[PDB]
Design a protein around this ligand. Structure first.
Ligand SMILES: CCCCCCCCCCCCCCCCCC(=O)OC[C@H](COP(=O)([O-])OCC(O)COP(=O)([O-])OC[C@@H](COC(=O)CCCCCCCCCCCCCCCCC)OC(=O)CCCCCCCCCCCCCCCCC)OC(=O)CCCCCCCCCCCCCCCCC
Ligand code: BCL
Ligand code: BCL
Ligand code: BCL
Ligand SMILES: CC[C@H]1c2cc3[nH]c4c(c3C)C(=O)[C@H](C(=O)OC)c4c3nc(cc4[nH]c(cc(n2)[C@@H]1C)c(C(C)=O)c4C)[C@@H](C)[C@@H]3CCC(=O)OC/C=C(\C)CCC[C@H](C)CCC[C@H](C)CCCC(C)C
Ligand SMILES: CC[C@H]1c2cc3[nH]c4c(c3C)C(=O)[C@H](C(=O)OC)c4c3nc(cc4[nH]c(cc(n2)[C@@H]1C)c(C(C)=O)c4C)[C@@H](C)[C@@H]3CCC(=O)OC/C=C(\C)CCC[C@H](C)CCC[C@H](C)CCCC(C)C
Ligand SMILES: CC(C)=CCC/C(C)=C\CC/C(C)=C/CC/C(C)=C/CC/C(C)=C/CC/C(C)=C\CC/C(C)=C/CC/C(C)=C/CC1=C(C)C(=O)c2ccccc2C1=O
Ligand SMILES: COC(C)(C)C/C=C/C(C)=C/C=C/C(C)=C/C=C/C(C)=C/C=C\C=C(C)\C=C\C=C(C)\C=C\C=C(C)\C=C\CC(C)(C)OC
Ligand code: HEM
Ligand SMILES: CCCCCCCCCCCCCCCC(=O)OC[C@H](CO)OC(=O)CCCCCCCCCCCCCCC
Ligand SMILES: CCCCCCCCCCCC[N+](C)(C)[O-]
Ligand SMILES: [Ca+2]
Ligand SMILES: [Ca+2]
Ligand SMILES: [Ca+2]
Ligand SMILES: [Ca+2]
Ligand SMILES: [Fe+3]
Ligand SMILES: [Mg+2]
Lengths: 277, 259, 318, 311, 43, 51, 62, 51
């Protein structure tokens, strides 16, 4: 179906590729050329994940427990070449399908943006999430010299990867880009709660009260912290905090291993060894 | 009290399951709040049954909530019911999910990127009751920041670089001191039309405002306001939507595809 | 290219807004507002005025005492050397009491100063919470911010007060220091068997990730429709315009479902609040009802099994 | 900042990320600083015996004079090459023990001989040589004493932590893990081995002490935590590596060295060999490994000197 | 004196003064409790 | 040492000076007491005197 | 072939081409630094360290 | 030491300069005392003098 105000917006055109061939809707979704490509990229990737679960690490360890399902990358001994399907090659195909699905999803958003005549901030913001994924499975493995540095595709097994990569630097909290990325993540969560609270508290005021104005919003945080960023700028700030967190997270993992091999606390020895002290 | 509830169950397992029940209830609540706009859905399922089947999915709609607007501007119900509206377009193909081709001139069709709802025909009011979006000629205490170029007198050019007019005045938000619209004197008939700041690319060095949305010739058909010194919520949407249609209708190449 | 609405090209100056009038008997707002040009390029140019009531004043006094005690103990830890204070500042901290003291009050340098800093900081945070409650109440607004702040306070209390009391030891609490509290975070996970396998740690991350997801989605969405006045969210909520329709329609065409201009802030509010609610619960479960999260995950079939390509002979099993 | 790619050694299962990363240029520099000494030519078999020729040989009495002379030449290169043969001897009287270096070095021979014969769970036929620690220096470069930590005001009890220290790889962890673990026998394990609480009262602060020790262990061997652990379960020996078993014996081996060999020599050593708390310079993991996963990167020097094995 | 209240707001001053005194009173009791020689809640 | 030193109150706000002076002296007073409490030779609570 | 400059902006073409060539040059130089055979920063007289007596530069792995 | 040194007050605001000087001198005095307390030689509280 479509929203009660949606029909006047369902217009032909705005496609990047395909023209009128794929320009249609399936239920609520707009498909387009990249919806078709993205769906079958996703379909093949999901089916190979299920097949990877079906064969498992081996026959005895095979499991359909969704927590324990894991499709692992190749051994580092394979370098940047292709691996046999049951020795990490399935991970390589799924990664390619994932990249195809994510880029198609981003490009489908571009076509939707063109149909609606709105800005391209949303596909641009999603590209940062894709870029972070690309750093994890493409850029860092290539810089490290092996596809085996990618994280395994498993709900809990990719947490074991994060844990062990973190302890490859003995104390990952001292990663300066990690500290900056966490600061943006925590600040974003704080800024999101503040923004959600302010909008809700103004449009849903006290019992027997009218909806507040923009003056109330500015006055409220000026009364608390002495500064109000503004109704428009809080969305810039929220976008900046969220994208900066992902950018610095991509930096933090790409410098871990490729551009730094010692323990992360040792990186701060440049500060400790300044001749000032 | 112990950590183990049975041989296999423990407190941590009960707590996570307790969260899932709450989280499921929370999602139902949030989805119910989501469906206060644009519901019941418009579908061929409803059209073919003659309105006998309402498409709302799950969860169904919530009870109407009231927004008491300030300065006794009325009370608006979020899960309201709107009158049926006819689009100014025809389907490209008859199968469900097919798009529509706008009728007549696409810029003036009011369809697609140029489509817009009929908002309330009253101005947005400040906390004191004065109109919020007003030109700088009546917001006398408002002024351009010293370090920024004054938009007045700048040349407005369209998508193709052709001169469309000059910025006669600047419209600002009184509640939050920012520029909203540029009042452009069209150099074709001397009629002042509003240009939203979101469709304006300032060129400080040349004192030029670049409007990639529409051509210079399209400024003559920008929707106009009844009162020259205030704009209603209805007219704000009409002005912004007209420029938005240009992003898809101004040039043949903008409909795509790239290849 | 097209104006991306990231920076304000042309700023307009108006006389500084004093604020919505407060009810009778309220203190006047302090500070003469100023206009920062660079603050106006990204946001609103006006800085100030601020309201400093009785509760805010008390929070300041309690808060400074906590910060002063922390800084003094940091300076004492480097034997008053202010140069060594700057060098080691990130590494310096105020340690909680040693394990042998339990919940008793130890000497000053053996955790006594930590308890005072912990108490004074807690009081200032609670007083600041009352301040956020009263500012919203004075303006006729609802208490969503206070609820969200209370959720964050709940997690803060879980870290330093509730869980240490449950464990019967102040030594379980968080040190006051930049790197020391990161060492505590790492040691906490190590001590209790890989906090990655705490399901409420997993949920907290999902909501922390979701908060960045939602704000990126919502922030980009509002900037995308800001050309239709989408930033004026109150007006869009009360009188739905084309900005709110296109925003909702974009997400319906993208992922099959959408929120409203109002309910997206309920998704935003709950995602951020659940980050620290689940964080607090997961902390309270750790060490109290679960000793080893990885072994808890093994018990509940959550931890994956890997082929045994590497193993170590246990030297205790002899 | 370093430049990629590092030399990576995979230890665990694929996707588990149990790997060792080595900067090839940093590794090259480390190896050049940890080169072994070429073994002396083999002594001539036969000849006079030490027992019926020398007067005061109490440890190496099972050798022949040819091998004994070769041993003395080697330990001169290993310990006191600049100071020469007179560093450990009274000039003109070889049998004299009236010099502290002679008394210490005799106990050092027992240390090496006990290590090469009784601690193969750790040194595994590679063995140790006087050069493994001394590297041509009378005082081994990497030794430790009980660290008081940074200076504190007289009325402030030291925490022993929250201070940037190279002993814990520049973290704020407890900066003196040597004393409770490599000299005393404090329990290193802190992690409970049941899903639900079952009486493990170990404090979170004790985990920071184990973490500090593990930072020093990993820094001493130039490896990361995954060299011996699967970080998803640090307690679990089944998911660990064989190097964890070796490191377990090394901890007991170092305690044996410090308690039974270094500590009883404290009275003989001068004041310059003691720390502020009066304890002598002691042996840590860094003393032999000196930043490498094996001392001298696995160079085999002890097998060429039969004097370094117990009879 | 007395004119000190012509420059100091009596409302703001008393809250700041009473808050400081309460913090000071809490601080001193905490210090005495920390001191084994003056902790009055022992045997 | 100047008969015109009273003119300083024409330059700096007397109210802000008093707030700053009182706040600084209180923090200085606390800091000096805490330094002496952190010094074993001058901690009057843990020195054992009187016995 | 002036047709190229009729359809492509000379300022944007040179900015793109210059950035591309500079990026390509940086990439190729790094590709040579990756291989120790062509790593000229090791010095003209570079000689790998000699491993003797059972030395191994790297620990055994998989 | 120029005769027209008094003209510097026509360039720098006396209130800001006086606040900056007083703040700097205070922080400077605190820093020097703390540095001396950090030294064994000049810590007058821990030197045991007078006995
Ligand atoms: C703790 C964090 C983690 C928690 C766990 C999270 C797990 C992951 C969650 C995954 C959620 C997937 C949602 C998919 C939506 C699909 C579209 C849809 O129909 O929406 C249904 C529903 C709304 O239905 P509706 O639009 O009112 O119904 C329209 C009519 O029924 C229309 O009538 P109809 O007859 O068309 O209805 C059929 C309907 C039936 O739908 C269902 O059965 C439900 C599907 C989801 C279950 O299916 C469709 O409408 C689609 C038609 C067929 C097309 C399908 C193929 C599309 C191909 C094109 C793709 C191009 C690329 O949307 C949702 O249920 C959204 C759930 C959101 C869950 C969020 C939880 C995760 C985030 C938590 C953190 C955030 C902060 C929280 C505080
Ligand atoms: C050695 C440790 C001794 C001890 C020795 C001392 C000494 C010495 C003193 C106290 C003082 C106090 N002790 Mg005692 N005290 C001990 C143990 C305790 C215990 C306990 C559970 O063990 C408690 C709850 C207290 C509580 C108190 C408070 C009643 C009082 C601090 C008040 C204050 O800070 O006001 C500051 C906070 C404010 C908000 C000030 C404003 C006051 C009100 C709001 C305004 C009223 C105006 C009115 C006209 C002025 C008179 C007020 C009078 C308090 C009635 N003590 C042990 C046994 N205690 C102090 C005292 O007697 O003060 C009166 C004090 O000098
Ligand atoms: C270590 C050895 C001694 C000791 C040695 C000293 C020495 C030396 C000094 C003190 C001083 C103080 N000590 Mg003592 N002190 C000890 C132990 C203690 C203990 C304790 C629990 O054991 C406490 C609570 C105190 C507390 C105090 C304070 C009463 C005082 C610091 C006040 C201040 O900082 O004002 C700063 C805050 C302000 C706001 C300053 C302004 C003052 C007023 C409020 C402002 C207006 C003034 C008014 C207009 C004047 C009117 C006059 C005309 C009529 C107009 N000491 C030990 C036992 N202590 C100091 C002192 O005596 O100061 C008076 C001081 O020099
Ligand atoms: C022992 C482990 C170490 C540690 C080791 C690591 C390692 C290793 C990593 C991090 C990374 C991160 N760490 Mg860390 N980290 C530690 C402790 C912490 C603590 C804490 C409280 O202690 C915090 C807050 C963090 C926080 C962070 C973030 C900065 C970052 C993760 C976010 C991110 O990368 O976004 C990026 C977001 C993505 C990659 C998501 C991609 C989205 C894609 C494009 C879309 C997928 C669509 C999906 C398939 C749809 C399904 C369909 C459904 C139906 C919906 N770490 C400890 C000390 N940390 C990671 C990082 O920085 O990566 C860049 C990382 O690799
Ligand atoms: C960059 C700022 C933050 C951000 C932004 C962001 N994300 C976005 C967007 C934006 C702006 C979208 O517009 C887009 C969207 O549609 O949102 C609703 C999206 C999106 N972000 C999503 C998820 C997501 N974002 C994350 C993070 C972030 N997104 C950042 C913190 C994470 C994290 C941290 O884990 C997740 C899981 C989706 C809901 C959606 C994109 C949907 C998509 O790409 O669909 C195509 C793919 C499928 C339909 C199925 C997957 C097909 C694959 C072949 C399967 C294999 C996947 C993987 C390789 C293995 C499994 C993973 C294991 C780890 C378990
Ligand atoms: C939804 C969960 C997220 C969240 C939410 C959240 N946080 C919040 C709120 C909310 C909803 C608030 O309303 C509240 C607030 O005010 O926000 C602006 C706050 C807040 N969250 C804050 C921080 C914060 N939030 C964090 C995290 C999070 N907050 C979560 C991610 C973190 C992290 C990740 O570590 C931090 C550090 C604060 C900015 C603020 C609460 C401030 C507070 O309680 O302050 C108390 C008072 C003091 C400490 C004053 C000390 C400083 C003074 C300058 C001292 C000197 C004064 C004077 C000069 C002394 C004079 C001498 C004396 C002797 C008198
Ligand atoms: C059971 C079964 C059939 C199994 C088979 C599975 C198989 C084989 C294949 C399935 C896999 C395949 C092929 C998938 C193909 C692609 C498909 C169908 C994708 C589905 C879409 C999808 C990924 C949905 C996920 C959405 C999720 C989980 C999270 C999104 C983030 C989130 C929490 C959003 C909720 C909040 C909302 C609605 C935000 C949008 C939103 C924002 C951000 C505003 O700012 C705004 C402003 C003003 C008005 C409205 C809005 C608004 O709606
Ligand atoms: C201007 O400032 C000056 C120069 C004067 C002083 C400067 C000081 C400085 C530089 C301070 C720097 C401080 C820093 C860097 C602090 C960092 C702090 C961090 C990172 C803290 C992080 C976490 C801490 C937590 C979570 C602590 C939680 C503690 C709690 C909740 C404690 C509660 C304790 C209570 C309620 C105590 C009860 C005591 C009982 C026994 C009742 O008391 C008797
Ligand atoms: C047989 C070979 C060895 C000989 C001949 C030898 C000799 C000596 C001598 C002479 C001293 C005293 C030096 C001095 O105080 O100036 C000494 C001290 C010491 N040796 Fe050895 N040693 C040998 C092997 C080892 C080994 C294998 C280790 C490491 C485990 C070691 C560690 C030390 C330490 C820690 C000291 C104390 C520091 C010092 O006093 O200088 N030695 N050794
Ligand atoms: C084409 C351009 C690149 C040419 C060179 C090839 C790649 C090698 C880069 C330089 C390698 C090197 O020797 O660097 C040494 C110094 C020392 O490294 C650093 O300081 C770089 C630190 C990391 C910065 C990021 C590098 C790029 C990785 C991808 C980042 C993606 C971020 C956005 C994700 C959304
Ligand atoms: C919010 C805290 C709820 C109460 C938690 C109390 C746990 C502390 C231990 C109480 C019993 C102590 N003990 C030794 C008698 O068992
Ligand atoms: Ca090192
Ligand atoms: Ca006394
Ligand atoms: Ca000292
Ligand atoms: Ca003295
Ligand atoms: Fe918003
Ligand atoms: Mg610590």
């Amino acid at each position: 179906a479509m929203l009660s105000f949606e029909r006047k917006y369902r217009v032909r055109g705005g496609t990047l590729i395909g023209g009128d061939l794929f320009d249609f809707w399936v239920g609520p979704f707009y498909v387009g050329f990249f919806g078709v490509a993205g769906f079958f990229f996703a379909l093949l990737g999901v089916l190979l994940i299920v097949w990877g679960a079906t064969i498992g690490p081996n026959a005895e360890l095979q499991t359909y427990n969704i927590w324990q399902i894991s499709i692992a990358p190749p051994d580092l001994s394979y370098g940047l070449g292709m691996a046999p399907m049951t020795e990490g090659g399935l991970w390589q195909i799924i990664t390619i399908c994932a990249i195809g699905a994510f880029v198609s999803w981003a490009l489908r958003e571009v076509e939707i943006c063109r149909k609606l005549g709105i800005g391209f901030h949303i596909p641009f913001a999603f590209a940062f999430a894709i870029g972070a994924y690309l750093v994890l499975v493409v850029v860092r493995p290539i810089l490290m010299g092996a596809w085996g540095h990618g994280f395994p595709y498993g709900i809990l097994s990719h947490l074991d990867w994060v844990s062990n990569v973190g302890y490859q630097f003995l104390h990952f909290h001292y990663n300066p880009a990690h500290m900056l990325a966490i600061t943006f993540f925590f600040t974003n969560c704080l800024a999101l709660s503040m923004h959600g609270s302010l909008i809700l508290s103004v449009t849903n005021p006290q019992k027997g009260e009218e909806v507040k104005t923009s003056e109330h919003e500015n006055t409220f945080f000026r009364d608390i912290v002495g500064y109000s960023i503004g109704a428009l700028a809080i969305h810039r700030l929220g976008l900046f905090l969220a994208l900066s967190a992902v950018f610095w997270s991509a930096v933090c993992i790409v410098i871990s291993g490729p551009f730094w091999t010692r323990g992360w606390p040792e990186w701060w020895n440049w500060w400790l060894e300044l001749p000032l002290w | 009290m112990s950590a183990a509830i049975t041989e296999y169950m423990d407190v941590a397992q009960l707590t996570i399951w307790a969260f899932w029940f709450f989280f499921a209830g929370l999602i139902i609540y949030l989805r119910r709040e989501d469906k206060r706009e644009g519901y019941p859905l418009d579908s061929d399922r409803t059209e073919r049954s003659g309105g006998r089947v309402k498409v709302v999915g799950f969860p169904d709609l919530a009870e109407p909530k009231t927004f008491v607007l300030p300065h006794n501007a009325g009370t608006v119900m979020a899960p309201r019911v709107e009158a049926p509206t006819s689009i100014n377009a025809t389907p490209v193909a008859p199968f469900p999910g097919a798009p529509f081709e706008p009728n007549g001139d696409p810029m003036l069709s009011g369809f697609g990127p140029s489509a817009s709802p009929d908002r309330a025909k009253h101005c947005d009011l400040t906390f004191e009751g004065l109109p919020k979006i007003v030109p700088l000629r009546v917001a006398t205490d408002f002024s351009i920041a010293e370090r920024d170029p004054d938009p007045r007198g700048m040349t407005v050019v369209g998508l193709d670089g052709e001169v469309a007019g000059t910025v006669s005045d600047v419209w600002v938000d009184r509640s939050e001191p920012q520029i909203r619209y540029l009042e452009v004197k069209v150099a074709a008939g001397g009629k002042n039309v509003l240009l939203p700041i979101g469709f304006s690319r300032f060129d400080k060095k040349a004192r030029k405002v670049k409007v990639a949305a529409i051509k210079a010739a399209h400024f003559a058909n920008v929707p106009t306001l009844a009162k020259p010194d205030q704009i209603t919520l209805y007219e704000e949407d009409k002005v912004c939507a007209y420029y938005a249609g240009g992003k898809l209708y101004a040039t043949a190449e903008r409909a795509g595809p790239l290849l | 290219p097209e104006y991306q609405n990231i920076f304000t090209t042309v700023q307009v100056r108006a006389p500084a807004y004093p604020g919505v009038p407060l009810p009778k008997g309220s203190l006047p707002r302090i500070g003469k507002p100023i206009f920062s040009y660079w603050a106006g390029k990204i946001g609103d140019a006006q800085i100030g005025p601020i309201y400093l009531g009785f509760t805010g004043t008390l929070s300041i006094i309690f808060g400074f005492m906590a910060i002063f005690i922390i800084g003094f103990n940091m300076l004492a830890s480097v034997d008053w050397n202010i140069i060594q204070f700057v060098k080691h500042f990130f590494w310096l901290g105020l340690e909680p009491p040693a394990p042998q003291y339990g919940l008793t009050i130890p000497p000053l340098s053996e955790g006594g100063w930590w308890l005072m800093a912990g108490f004074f900081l807690t009081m200032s945070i609670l007083l600041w919470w009352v301040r956020t409650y009263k500012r919203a109440e004075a303006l006729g607004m609802s208490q969503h911010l206070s609820w969200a702040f209370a959720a964050a306070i709940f997690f803060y209390l879980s870290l330093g007060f509730i869980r240490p009391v449950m464990m019967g030891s102040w030594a379980e609490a968080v040190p006051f220091g930049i790197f020391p509290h990161l060492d505590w975070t790492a040691a906490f996970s190590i001590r209790y068997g890989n906090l990655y396998y705490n399901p409420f740690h997993m949920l907290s991350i999902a909501f922390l990730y979701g908060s960045a997801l939602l704000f990126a989605m919502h922030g980009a969405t509002i900037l995308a429709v800001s050309r239709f006045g989408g930033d004026r969210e109150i007006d869009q909520i009360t009188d739905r315009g084309t900005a709110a329709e296109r925003a909702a329609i974009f997400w319906r065409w993208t992922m099959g479902f959408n929120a409203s201009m109002e309910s997206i802030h309920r998704w935003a509010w709950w995602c951020a609040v659940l980050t620290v609610i689940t964080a607090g619960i997961g902390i309270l479960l750790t060490g109290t009802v679960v000793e080893n999260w990885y072994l808890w995950a093994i018990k509940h079939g959550v931890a994956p099994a890997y082929p045994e390509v590497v193993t170590a002979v246990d030297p205790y099993a002899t | 900042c370093e430049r990629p790619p590092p030399e990576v050694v995979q230890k665990g299962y694929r996707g588990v990320a149990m790997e060792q990363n080595y900067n090839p240029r940093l590794l090259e520099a480390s190896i050049k600083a940890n080169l072994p000494v070429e073994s002396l030519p083999a002594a001539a078999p036969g000849g006079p015996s030490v027992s019926d020729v020398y007067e005061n040989v109490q440890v190496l009495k099972d050798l022949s004079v040819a091998e004994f002379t070769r041993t003395m030449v080697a330990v001169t290169t290993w310990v006191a090459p600049k100071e020469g043969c007179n560093y450990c001897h009274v000039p003109g009287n070889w049998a004299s023990d009236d010099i502290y270096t002679k008394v210490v070095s005799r106990r050092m021979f027992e240390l090496v001989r006990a290590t090469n014969s009784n601690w193969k769970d750790h040194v595994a036929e590679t063995g140790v040589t006087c050069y493994t620690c001394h590297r041509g220096n009378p005082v081994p470069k990497y030794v430790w004493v009980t660290d008081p930590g940074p200076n504190q005001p007289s009325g402030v009890t030291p925490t022993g932590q929250n201070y940037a220290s190279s002993t814990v790889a520049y973290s704020a962890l407890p900066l003196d893990p040597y004393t409770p673990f490599l000299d005393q026998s404090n329990e290193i394990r802190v992690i409970g081995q049941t899903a639900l609480p079952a009486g493990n009262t170990t404090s979170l602060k004790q985990a920071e002490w184990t973490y500090g020790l593990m930072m020093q262990i990993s820094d001493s061997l130039g490896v990361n935590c995954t060299f011996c652990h699967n970080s998803r379960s640090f307690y679990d020996w089944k998911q660990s590596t064989p190097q964890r078993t070796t490191a377990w014996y090394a901890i007991r081996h170092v305690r044996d060295i410090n308690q039974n060999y270094i500590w009883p020599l404290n009275d003989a050593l001068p004041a310059s060999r003691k720390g502020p708390y009066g304890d002598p310079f002691k042996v840590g993991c860094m003393t032999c490994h000196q930043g490498a996963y094996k001392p001298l990167y696995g160079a085999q020097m002890a097998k060429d000197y039969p004097a370094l094995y117990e009879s | 004196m007395h004119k000190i209240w012509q420059i100091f707001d009596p409302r703001r001053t008393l809250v700041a003064l009473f808050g400081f005194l309460f913090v000071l009173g809490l601080l001193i009791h905490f210090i005495l409790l920390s001191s084994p020689a003056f902790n009055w809640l022992s045997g | 040492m100047s008969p015109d030193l009273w003119k300083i109150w024409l330059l700096v706000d007397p109210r802000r000076i008093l707030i700053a002076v009182f706040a600084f002296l209180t923090v200085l007073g606390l800091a000096i007491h805490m330094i002496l409490l952190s010094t074993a030779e001058f901690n009057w609570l843990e020195d054992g005197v009187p016995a | 072939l002036y047709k190229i400059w009729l359809a492509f902006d000379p300022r944007m073409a040179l900015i793109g081409l210059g950035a591309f060539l500079f990026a390509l040059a940086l990439f190729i130089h790094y590709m040579l630094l990756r291989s120790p055979e062509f790593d000229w920063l090791l010095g003209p007289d570079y000689a790998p360290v000699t491993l003797s007596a059972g030395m191994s530069a790297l620990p055994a792995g998989r």
